[PDB]
Amino acid sequence: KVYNDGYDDDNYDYIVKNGEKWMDRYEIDSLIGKGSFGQVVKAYDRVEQEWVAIKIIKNKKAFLNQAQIEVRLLELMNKHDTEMKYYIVHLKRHFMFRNHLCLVFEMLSYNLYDLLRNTNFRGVSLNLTRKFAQQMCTALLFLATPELSIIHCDLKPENILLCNPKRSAIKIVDFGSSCQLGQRIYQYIQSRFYRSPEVLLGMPYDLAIDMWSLGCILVEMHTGEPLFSGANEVDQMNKIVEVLGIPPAHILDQAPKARKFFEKLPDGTWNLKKTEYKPPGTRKLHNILGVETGGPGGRRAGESGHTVADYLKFKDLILRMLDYDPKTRIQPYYALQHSFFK
Ligand SMILES: CCC(=O)Nc1ccc(C(=O)c2sc(Nc3ccc(N4CCN(C)CC4)cc3OC)nc2N)cc1
């Protein structure tokens, strides 16, 4: 009947109450989100005199230990002096309150899915998409810092927020499924829509999985719809294949999960298993973006900064981010020097 003296519910979450004052400091206002980790709440900080987003972790060993790993990575990112760390959400501080670990973040505007929902899933401009692409590449360059080497491992429109509703500044959020580079513990990783072929194929992986995710995300910001919207791993891969063609043979020969999607024929070549989909490599990114047809759905026709020249620079940058090989896939440093950002 009673859970944590009545402060928790039946599934270990703290009972969020509007107007409750925590430690004579944090004035709780309203619930923002609830995940598996727990809940996140909007609260006003009285000593700092500013709004904050308090992430309230569940009263559970499994979710507490995971949030401690997140704290360790957030605080390790704060240690570095550079300016490019400000494209990640600032963990201000953490504390224990009535048996719940509470992470205090800076208060932010909406997520990028809410931005796409405001467009009725028709997308934002190539001018705005360039601004997010640069800042996300700057964020991924920060994560690639050798002493950090952090893989976010779950980049999607919901995990990218806007700083202010008027300003066009974005910041990457939720490092709950994040670990530093190393030996492989986890295979089923990333959100399916933004999941890399090396992850789908059961191959080794590294920082490059976040760039694949970025590539997908940036097309979705300008088109409005997800690029590869698979209902399962098979459907995911078939949608990747119909845009980028069949993965290269040398990758598929090494891949332990290659036989889930593809089939090695008697001649030695690889091909899709039977299951609807267009032939491999036929739904060109050129036509999805609308390089010559005035943008996606003809909606950017005659709008400034949406020329054939500007769309080809964007198409080229995206194809480098969506390289099948994670070794030749473009890195944050070279991405930031792409002609799309000139
Ligand atoms: C489902 C899991 C989830 O949302 N996790 C999560 C929750 C909160 C945060 C987080 O740190 C946030 S969320 C946030 N602002 C914010 C973002 C989106 C929203 N939404 C989300 C839902 N939407 C329908 C209404 C607008 C509300 C927010 O607070 C006003 N600021 C921070 N600092 C990061 C991740």
Curated annotation (Swiss-Prot):
What region holds the Protein kinase domain? 26-341
Q: Where in the cell is it found?
A: Nucleus; Nucleus speckle
Q: Any transmembrane segments, and where?
A: none
Q: How is it modified after translation?
A: Autophosphorylated on numerous tyrosine residues. Can also autophosphorylate on serine and threonine residues (in vitro).
| Region described as Disordered | 275-304
Describe the function of this protein: Dual-specificity kinase which possesses both serine/threonine and tyrosine kinase activities. Plays an important role in double-strand breaks (DSBs) repair following DNA damage. Mechanistically, phosphorylates RNF169 and increases its ability to block accumulation of TP53BP1 at the DSB sites thereby promoting homologous recombination repair (HRR).
Query: What is the protein's name according to its record?
Result: Dual specificity tyrosine-phosphorylation-regulated kinase 1A
